[PDB]
Write a protein that binds this ligand. Sequence first.
Ligand SMILES: O=c1ccn([C@@H]2O[C@H](COP(=O)(O)OP(=O)(O)O)[C@@H](O)[C@H]2O)c(=O)[nH]1
Ligand SMILES: O=c1ccn([C@@H]2O[C@H](COP(=O)(O)OP(=O)(O)O)[C@@H](O)[C@H]2O)c(=O)[nH]1
Lengths: 14, 14, 695, 695
Amino acid sequence: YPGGSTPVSSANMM
Amino acid sequence: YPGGSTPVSSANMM
Amino acid sequence: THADSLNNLANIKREQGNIEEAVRLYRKALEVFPEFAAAHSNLASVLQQQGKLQEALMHYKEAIRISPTFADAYSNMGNTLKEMQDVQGALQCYTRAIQINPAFADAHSNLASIHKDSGNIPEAIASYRTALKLKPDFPDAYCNLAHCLQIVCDWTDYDERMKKLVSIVADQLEKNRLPSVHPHHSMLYPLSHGFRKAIAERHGNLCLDKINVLHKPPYEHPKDLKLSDGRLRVGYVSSDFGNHPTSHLMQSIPGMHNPDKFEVFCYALSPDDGTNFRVKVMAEANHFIDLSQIPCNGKAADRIHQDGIHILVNMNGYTKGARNELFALRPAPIQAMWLGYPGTSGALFMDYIITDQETSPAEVAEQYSEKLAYMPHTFFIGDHANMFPHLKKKAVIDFKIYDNRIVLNGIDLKAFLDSLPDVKIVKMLNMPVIPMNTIAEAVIEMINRGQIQITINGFSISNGLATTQINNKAATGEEVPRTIIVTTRSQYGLPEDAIVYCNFNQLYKIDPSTLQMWANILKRVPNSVLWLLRFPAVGEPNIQQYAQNMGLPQNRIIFSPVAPKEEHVRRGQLADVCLDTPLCNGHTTGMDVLWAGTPMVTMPGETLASRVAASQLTCLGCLELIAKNRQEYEDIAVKLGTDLEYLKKVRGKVWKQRISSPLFNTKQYTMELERLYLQMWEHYAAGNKPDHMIK
Amino acid sequence: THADSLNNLANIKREQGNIEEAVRLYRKALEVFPEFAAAHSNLASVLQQQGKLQEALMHYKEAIRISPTFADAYSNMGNTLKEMQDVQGALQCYTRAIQINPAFADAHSNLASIHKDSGNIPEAIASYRTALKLKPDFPDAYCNLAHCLQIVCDWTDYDERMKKLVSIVADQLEKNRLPSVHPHHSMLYPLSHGFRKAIAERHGNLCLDKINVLHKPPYEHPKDLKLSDGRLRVGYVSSDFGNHPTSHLMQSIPGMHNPDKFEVFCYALSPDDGTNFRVKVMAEANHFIDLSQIPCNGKAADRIHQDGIHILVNMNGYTKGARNELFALRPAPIQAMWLGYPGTSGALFMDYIITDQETSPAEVAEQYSEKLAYMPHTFFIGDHANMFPHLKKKAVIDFKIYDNRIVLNGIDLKAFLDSLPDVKIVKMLNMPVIPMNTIAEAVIEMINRGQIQITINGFSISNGLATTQINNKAATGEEVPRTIIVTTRSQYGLPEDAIVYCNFNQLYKIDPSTLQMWANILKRVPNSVLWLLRFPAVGEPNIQQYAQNMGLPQNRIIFSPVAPKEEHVRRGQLADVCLDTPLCNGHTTGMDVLWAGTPMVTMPGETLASRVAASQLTCLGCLELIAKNRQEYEDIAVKLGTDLEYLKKVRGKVWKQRISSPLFNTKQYTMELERLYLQMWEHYAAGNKPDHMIK
Ligand SMILES: O=c1ccn([C@@H]2O[C@H](COP(=O)(O)OP(=O)(O)O)[C@@H](O)[C@H]2O)c(=O)[nH]1
Ligand SMILES: O=c1ccn([C@@H]2O[C@H](COP(=O)(O)OP(=O)(O)O)[C@@H](O)[C@H]2O)c(=O)[nH]1
């Protein structure tokens, strides 16, 4: 969120 | 330094 | 000349797979001729691949000094720094590579990946386009650009883009090269199930290749529960024990396991982030092991094996922070995929995928490399009953009866209502209604003035938009709010006299067919709006342009910023209906909307990711919300937005069933997971290889 | 229309200085008409200025929803997010502002500042140029671009650029507007001392304006030492108690204070970074107060006053993490500027500047708003004797005698040399020399092969380029290395048969006149190289181009990457001479080079920042290294590079004097600082206002 953080499921680096 | 950090004296935001 | 031959020999032994002999030979070439840029660059690449990043960095520094026009060494050094989490350093290296050689397509693509990972999608798009202008045949840049375009809902030449992605994947699989489409993104594109499984398998093979160099023998596994005193040792492996959707779904599960039959080990792949989610799992698991302090996959797998794990649970799959090399080493006799990854691992080292009959019907077993292990209702779970108990009940303020215009929620809401003189109880549990009097005026005045909080009869009445200013831990879901919170349509610019269709997922889940379906619904329901999120804000003008092209004025779509966790779940109460994305459903997001009591319309597809929402609805007991095709999806959504008595019935069903059904029942879920674990164990103990656990 | 008049009244009361009445009136305008974008945007700006960032953010979110074409609100919301340390969020906002209005010069400039602060100077330069293309008269963008250009050594139209900066500052000071040149950068440009002091004063005035809104009365100060049992209470205020040059200079000072006469309070403005520098100051100060946990400047100044501080020490000035508002509140009767800031605060709330006769001669008192408080030798100090005691002695390997080709250092170096059969002692203390035999071959083989370490007679022999792989705390200076380290010219590509002139500062300190002086030296000394750092790497091609234009081939300048702290100090032993930057000297960097025993040539200017190196050399006792003009600077540097017997004499003088002189003597320094403190106190106690303490 603006002013903080919203963690999400995301891809690992490749 | 590349792969780490080298802290330096720097200006405050304005 | 002798140094040249030594470098050639090292390259030969490198191709054979003998990495240690290659290192020894590169060092001998440097011993003979120390100012050898190519030998330094080759040794650095070899060390980087071994995970010896600091050592690789020494050799890249040598190559760049010796050959100042060696743009390739700057680019490769940038890749090593990126892996070391030195983002600024990596950017500096790619910047220098582009300055040395402006025609170096790879360096532009690597620079674009820094902009992408830093959230600057328009700059990522610009740098990928430069890479493709320079090198038209560039699978990594094309596929990474396609994902940037997906994130911002840029659908220019979409059908042709989708055909090219499929063509690129087909060629890479045929030529035995690692596909440029990430397995976690494969469900977003119209690839075959065979192709999606093959991409996953290639990623699984990378893990096996990385562990084969350790030359570790196969582990001796337990054959009974005697050494564990009749208890099944279950190991949960996750990089997400902390502030992350994974913990927001399963944080209560470890502590709900039966200690008489189970011994729980949680293997954290991430350091402690200081949040209550990490505190809870550390306090409630029988054992908590911080593997982030053990970077070697060999030593970390030895640790898992030493603990005597019977069932090792992969909660990452191909997601950020994963260490699938741990599973490739097979430290446990049974290894299962669970909850965190919505697809197949495609890997032989994973035995099972924990799913259900709705998500993964037996007919589609071919889409998975793993055997299917069914939970009885849905494999999906959420910690909403523990994290947001203040949303179990609600009261409304009648400002003219509506259940979603002005809403109150709080642990002490009953006591507050008891202090009020003219409260009406509308039978559904039941919904208390406060009339448009002095107390109702004070509430609306607070919202209009942007005031943080007020006091009514000694009770704390908080503005729902100001939770971070009142209690930041309550805003993130780390603590239950201790005040009464007000949520209103006016806080988000939503119309007081219209139907609100919502979708709170990241915009990448929307495709042209989905937006067209939504436009068709809006056109059929005059008094209606579509409520979406700036996820990211750069996707907003693209959605608005395509909606305008579909014949919808700007005022039919309302955007809100992404909100802190508690506010996001709470504001779902303002919508009438959630319109789920058929391409890739809301997973955590679907649980969030249903906890608010919001009916969700879905059209299940074929992939696991496109079927989760229908599995959640089937468990909930709302079969009427599941569409078989696009026309039925539109018809269900239009019926809900026009037949107000039907809408009331369905919203009432969702409101009651989120409690009475198994959906949010973490204790029942843990008990069913335990039943499934014992089935897997008894099958293995009897000397059988894994098979589908489908009854 | 009533809401319009209410917003107008709030704007009036805002201009008057009544911020609380302005807030109340903006809220009343919103009470009347809630969908008022201008009232939300004005209230947000007012709250942002009050430091109420979260509250300001609520109102910016309202403005952007109400008016989707309100690019100004997106840009201003971006500024609030930047202040909240949400860099990605801020970038998203500036990106949206530019998409809404591509002609919005301010948004491009704000986007350029994100690229600048994130270290991406070429992107910062590109965005500032777009801002200036759109708005030619834009002081903030022009001055910020001039600083980007300074960082990368881009000297295109330098003289005209310098004239324009002076013209911009002159106009801003005349029109009572905050100058666009930051006071910390003012010494880099040819501004008058009057202008540099006036810029500083305007920054000091911002702090006073921010504290006047708290409406706090003047504090009652102690008039004696009775309540402190005859002890002087000294408060050190710094955001740099941790891994930062400030702690690398003064970390031993708090613990060296005499407890019978002094009570030391360290006020940290930064959270604990987990480093040994923070551990040391927390363990050794009599009191350690974490003000990072007290964001309110009123409450933090109340805390300082409650402690009964007699002398409050400003270690930041206008540097990152400063809270000069604490000093503007005057919680102590004596407030002094010390060590961290190389210039005047220009502020009436600062009483003294701790300096010396060499740095700040009485003649130039006019350059400072503060009264001069002289330390007897230099105000400069370094913790080198405590942090790098392994560099107090050295041994060399004779590979053909040179003191700086192949160097060994270590706590156990004497014991290692005693285990060797044919060690020669060259009288200078003394320098042991190891001959070119079996042990000398094993050392060079390690370096050439890039090997991390070897063992000789049971002693640990480490490759100086691999310190982070051996002991990361020793690499950063947090721990003293426990192995014997090898440092060689071949590790950096330096010539074995030539004079090495070095400069390890950030490239921004170099200007065209300086590079020309250096080119003149190199041309006069055939067997010579200039050794510089990639600080940043993007400055390397600019320096190389200007050097080529001056007639120097590429091979006359050798670049190395920035190194971890210990390696940076240790590798200074490889140079013959350091060429100091006259524009702005090396300060911490000068102490680093002198600890290696490297003579430094300097030309002191008029500003404090241009005179530090000559003050360090005067204390050291090397007057012959101080140049009165450019010709003398070149003549001294050329004499050192050509008269080898003279070079030997000078290097020997530096080697001995870094120990025998007061330069690195922290105990003597603390005792002299204590003498100065008592002079300041006795002057105030006698009822006198501050005056120069110059004897
Ligand atoms: O305004 C919002 C919208 C979403 N979320 C959270 O953002 C995350 C999105 O994660 P992801 O995209 O992985 O959701 P999923 O695909 O599982 O629905 C979930 O924890 C949501 O609860 C949030 O806190 N605020
Ligand atoms: O290769 C290098 C070059 C410099 N430094 C350190 O970088 C900092 C630079 O800080 P600053 O620019 O403020 O130095 P100053 O202007 O005081 O010389 C100092 O702590 C140096 O010791 C370092 O660790 N490695």
